[PDB]
């Protein structure tokens, strides 16, 4: 069956609602290199659902960014971005 795999598609829709417009031109993107941004956007969409669906495999994607979830995705994405910047800066230290 693997209903959760289909849920990723729906989950993607939810994350795609805010993830792109948050990064595309924010304090993040002005520091975010191009490949960083493309990777962050697509991977935060999948990885967040994959991981939280790994928490709860029947976790249906919430409609939109509720205050609680919004706070969490912002903290997640912040550390995510830090992860890419720190790695690339390490090459140009």
> Which residue's entry shows tokens 């990777």?
39
Q: How far apart are CA 32 and CA 87, in angstroms?
A: 12
Q: How far apart are CA 61 and CA 6, in angstroms?
A: 11
CB 40 within 8 A of CB 77: yes
Both tokens of residue 10?
């729906």
Q: Specify burial of residue 1 (Cβ count, 10 A radius: 0-12, 13-18, 19+).
A: exposed
Phi/psi at 42 (nearest 5 deg)? -70, -35
What does 31-45 look like in DSSP terms, one character per residue?
T--HHHHHHHHHHHH
In words, the CATH class of domain 1-93 is mainly alpha
């Amino acid at each position: 069956v693997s209903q959760s795999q289909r849920l990723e598609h729906n989950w993607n829709k939810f994350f795609a609602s805010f993830v792109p417009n948050l990064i595309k031109k924010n304090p993040q993107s002005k520091q975010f290199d191009h490949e960083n941004i493309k990777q962050c956007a697509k991977d935060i969409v999948k990885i967040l659902t994959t991981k939280e669906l790994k928490k709860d495999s029947s976790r249906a994607p919430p409609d939109d960014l509720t205050k609680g979830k919004r706070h969490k995705v912002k903290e997640f994405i912040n550390s995510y971005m830090d992860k890419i910047i720190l790695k690339k800066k390490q090459k140009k230290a």
